[PDB]
Structure formats: structure tokens, C-alpha cells
């Protein structure tokens, strides 16, 4: 704990499936929740896991 | 026409129907879109009580 809030913690947030027990998952993209491809950049319906 | 405020919300209650959100393509333009607890591309194929 330190003044300001220290920012070296990361989680995951969005999937497309379910993991495994036992299992890492260190891909790190962009993903998109709707129908329109998000072209590889972040944007509407683009947001960063 | 008209909203409710922050303070005083609405609610209704939706049943007995069939969901198709196809109709929203051609008018609506959302800026938001995050689902909780269920794939986006699997709801066409679930059920809602």
C-alpha cells in the first residue's frame, strides 16, 4: 500500500470461453462484444481485458 | 417522449414474448455495451425469466 494506489496489479476481465483448472492464459488482445471486427484497434465496442 | 430522473426510476416488467433485437440495426446508434454474467453471441439461442 502506498500513496496514490500502486498500478502493478492486473486481472483479466473478458473471455470468449472458459479456462481449464490448472491453466494460464497470457494472450493479451483486443476484444470485441459485438458484430462489427474491431480491425486490430481499440475503439467503440473495443475495450482492453 | 419523456424519462424518469436519478432519484425517481421506473420499472416494467417484460413477459410472455419472443426476443429479436435484429429491429434496433436500421435507427439505433448505442455508445455502451457490456454484458455480465452471459456471452453476447449466446443469447439468441437462451431463455429469460
Do not use: H, M
Not at chain 2, 413477459?15 to 439505433?28: Q, R, T
Amino acid at each position: 500500500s502506498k500513496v496514490g494506489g500502486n498500478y502493478n496489479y492486473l486481472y483479466r476481465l473478458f473471455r470468449k470461453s472458459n479456462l481449464k483448472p490448472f491453466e494460464r492464459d497470457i494472450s493479451t488482445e483486443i476484444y470485441q462484444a459485438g458484430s462489427t471486427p474491431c480491425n486490430g484497434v481499440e475503439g467503440f465496442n473495443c475495450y482492453f481485458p | 417522449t419523456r424519462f424518469a430522473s436519478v432519484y425517481a426510476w421506473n420499472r416494467k416488467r417484460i413477459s410472455n414474448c419472443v426476443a429479436d433485437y435484429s429491429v434496433l440495426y436500421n435507427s439505433a446508434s448505442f455508445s455502451t455495451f457490456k454484458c455480465y454474467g452471459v456471452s453476447p453471441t449466446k443469447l439468441n439461442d437462451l431463455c429469460f425469466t
